[PDB]
Amino acid sequence: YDLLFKIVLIGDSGVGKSNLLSRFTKNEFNMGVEFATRTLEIEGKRIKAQIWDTAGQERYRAITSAYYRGAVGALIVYDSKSSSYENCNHWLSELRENADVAVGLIGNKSDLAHLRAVPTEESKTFAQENQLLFTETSALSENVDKAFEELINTIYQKVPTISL
Amino acid sequence: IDTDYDVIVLGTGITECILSGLLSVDGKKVLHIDKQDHYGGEAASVTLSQLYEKFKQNPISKEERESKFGKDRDWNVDLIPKFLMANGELTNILIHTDVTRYVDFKQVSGSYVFKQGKIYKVPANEIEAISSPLMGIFEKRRMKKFLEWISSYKEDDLSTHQGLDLDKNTMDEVYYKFGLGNSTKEFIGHAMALWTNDDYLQQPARPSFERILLYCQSVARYGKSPYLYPMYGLGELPQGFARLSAIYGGTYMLDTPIDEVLYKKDTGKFEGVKTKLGTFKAPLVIADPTYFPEKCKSTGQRVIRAICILNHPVPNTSNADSLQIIIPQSQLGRKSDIYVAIVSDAHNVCSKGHYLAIISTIIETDKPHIELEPAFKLLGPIEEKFMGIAELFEPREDGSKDNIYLSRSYDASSHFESMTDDVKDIYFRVTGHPLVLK
Numbered sequence: 336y337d338l339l340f341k342i343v344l345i346g347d348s349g350v351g352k353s354n355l356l357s358r359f360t361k362n363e364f365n366m367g368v369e370f371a372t373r374t375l376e377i378e379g380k381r382i383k384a385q386i387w388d389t390a391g392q393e394r395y396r397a398i399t400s401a402y403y404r405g406a407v408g409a410l411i412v413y414d415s416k417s418s419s420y421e422n423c424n425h426w427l428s429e430l431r432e433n434a435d436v437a438v439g440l441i442g443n444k445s446d447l448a449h450l451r452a453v454p455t456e457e458s459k460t461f462a463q464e465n466q467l468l469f470t471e472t473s474a475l476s477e478n479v480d481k482a483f484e485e486l487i488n489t490i491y492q493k494v495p496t497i498s499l
Numbered sequence: 500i501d502t503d504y505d506v507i508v509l510g511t512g513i514t515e516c517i518l519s520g521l522l523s524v525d526g527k528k529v530l531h532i533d534k535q536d537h538y539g540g541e542a543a544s545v546t547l548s549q550l551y552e553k554f555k556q557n558p559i560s561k562e563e564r565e566s567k568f569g570k571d572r573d574w575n576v577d578l579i580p581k582f583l584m585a586n587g588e589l590t591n592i593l594i595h596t597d598v599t600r601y602v603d604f605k606q607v608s609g610s611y612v613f614k615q616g617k618i619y620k621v622p623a624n625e626i627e628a629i630s631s632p633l634m635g636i637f638e639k640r641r642m643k644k645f646l647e648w649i650s651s652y653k654e655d656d657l658s659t660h661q662g663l664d665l666d667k668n669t670m671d672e673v674y675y676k677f678g679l680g681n682s683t684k685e686f687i688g689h690a691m692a693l694w695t696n697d698d699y700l701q702q703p704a705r706p707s708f709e710r711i712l713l714y715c716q717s718v719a720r721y722g723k724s725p726y727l728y729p730m731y732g733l734g735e736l737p738q739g740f741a742r743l744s745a746i747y748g749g750t751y752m753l754d755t756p757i758d759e760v761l762y763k764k765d766t767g768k769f770e771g772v773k774t775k776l777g778t779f780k781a782p783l784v785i786a787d788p789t790y791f792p793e794k795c796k797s798t799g800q801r802v803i804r805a806i807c808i809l810n811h812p813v814p815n816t817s818n819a820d821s822l823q824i825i826i827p828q829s830q831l832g833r834k835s836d837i838y839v840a841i842v843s844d845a846h847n848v849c850s851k852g853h854y855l856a857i858i859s860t861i862i863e864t865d866k867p868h869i870e871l872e873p874a875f876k877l878l879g880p881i882e883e884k885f886m887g888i889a890e891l892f893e894p895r896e897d898g899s900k901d902n903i904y905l906s907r908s909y910d911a912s913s914h915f916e917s918m919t920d921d922v923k924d925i926y927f928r929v930t931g932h933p934l935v936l937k
């Protein structure tokens with residue numbers, strides 16, 4: 336691989352961030368991993384995507400600034416729960432402060448559409464104005480692979496420490 | 500939502516986060532709380548606007564800060580200046596716990612020592628040792644023979660000791676054996692052993708010997724200097740270990756003050772804490788002094804730290820992107836040394852073209868600002884100064900009576916060796932067994 340994109344997952348606890356990671360990389364589903372990787376080729380270039388997870392640190396707003404260090408891309412994840420959706424406002428402000436970056440928004444758990452709170456209509460409008468792309472996903476329906484890859488395509492347009 | 504833990508930790512200073520990370524790795528259930536909205540505790544790295552908040556009367560206008568300093572996101576400014584010894588115990592902990600995964604490092608360009616108005620690069624190798632104008636030919640010869648003994652000495656082999664006894668000889672006698680002049684003593688004691696006064700001269704050699712050897716080993720590990728410095732500032736360190744804790748099951752609460760410490764009915768022993776998020780309980784607590792002021796005592800020492808922003812490299816450093824300055828006390832009629840720790844945009848701690856020069860010493864007059872004048876004059880023109888005084892606290896007790904294991908305040912030393920000493924000491928007090936690195 337000739338390019339390495341560090342991308343981070345954010346948003347409220349419970350949404351599905353951990354599962355969206357294990358889906359896109361390991362095609363698995365739980366009912367925790369530090370980070371998982373996946374390589375794609377874009378314009379003949381091998382791109383490793385390093386996708387970091389929160390270790391549950393988002394629960395009481397304890398995400399380290401170091402989590403965003405050198406991150407060239409990021410996904411905000413909401414839930415079935417308008418609470419998380421409204422909280423997506425918070426994580427946007429968090430990210431542009433600590434990162435550098437290309438951002439995308441995802442509405443996970445679309446498989447449970449029979450318990451929907453706040454429709455697709457608003458989520459698209461919310462995304463369209465705020466310059467970040469949208470993709471309604473489900474980790475169990477699955478727009479998982481599309482969402483991650485769509486983000487990776489977009490980052491591709493953008494472009495001595497010592498070991499102990 | 501959990502309420503019962505094996506360990507509660509308060510404050511996200513480096514000391515606490517290392518212990519948290521170690522205990523979580525050990526398989527303990529750790530709850531770590533900070534009343535502040537960011538990680539680092541007393542030794543965090545902060546933004547330029549935060550510096551104005553903490554140390555200045557009013558903030559600075561948007562256009563003044565914009566034209567002079569650029570964007571606040573480029574600024575990660577250490578509140579307490581420290582480097583890491585390259586062969587020191589913190590690097591050893593970073594390797595074993597693999598926190599090296601969360602932090603990148605660069606080597607400090609060199610160390611410089613003040614002598615009669617000018618600074619001099621401490622020789623890092625033989626080429627530099629030959630060229631150096633610090634000492635004369637016979638002085639260099641005598642010290643060469645001294646440092647050869649440092650490296651060839653073996654504890655359990657008495658035939659290598661050249662008649663010296665680390666425990667029964669003072670360092671002055673070690674010096675005496677090798678014929679060393681007072682100026683060569685000052686160099687060794689202050690530039691290599693990193694003592695901040697001459698008390699060591701009349702004390703058993705063993706501590707001086709250990710520090711000197713650590714110096715030599717640290718410079719040998721990679722070259723150039725004994726020192727490393729983290730990209731994005733010292734604040735990356737606690738955050739690294741906190742992340743280790745979380746991965747290993749630790750729970751973290753920022754911006755969560757302690758409403759009340761709970762104590763066992765009749766013993767005074769720790770029971771838990773009340774917060775806005777609820778009540779949490781543990782058989783014991785680890786905390787910095789700010790959480791238990793009544794259970795700490797003052798060491799008697801106050802430390803002035805002056806953060807200086809510069810538009811230019813430090814004069815007489817060959818445009819070094821980082822360095823350490825050592826001003827021995829006898830060069831100033833002082834009781835203790837003055838340090839300067841200098842880093843730049845090479846370390847992602849300030850915006851392009853700036854340098855951070857942090858001057859510290861232990862205060863000994865009623866005018867701390869004037870005490871620092873000698874060091875101010877070494878830096879060239881200074882864009883801005885941020886002045887802060889801190890008092891050094893330490894626990895009254897070891898925690899065996901109340902289960903309140905308190906850390907010491909970050910001291911005036913130039914590196915983290917005394918911090919990792921605290922860690923090992925606290926770990927033993929908390930677990931009953933010495934720290935074994937996996």
Ligand SMILES: Nc1nc2c(ncn2[C@@H]2O[C@H](COP(=O)(O)OP(=O)(O)O)[C@@H](O)[C@H]2O)c(=O)[nH]1
Nearest residue numbers: 348349350351352353354365366444473474475
């Ligand atoms: N039905 C359904 N459940 C999900 C989905 N994603 C996550 N979950 C469930 O939500 C719970 C917590 O999700 P998690 O991956 O930990 O989200 P996180 O807290 O943001 O990391 C788990 O028990 C999952 O089974 C989904 O797409 N559909």
Ligand SMILES: [Cl-]
Nearest residue numbers: 583584587915
């Ligand atoms: Cl160190």
Ligand SMILES: [Cl-]
Nearest residue numbers: 638679680683
């Ligand atoms: Cl000499």
Ligand SMILES: [Mg+2]
Nearest residue numbers: 352353390391
């Ligand atoms: Mg998760």
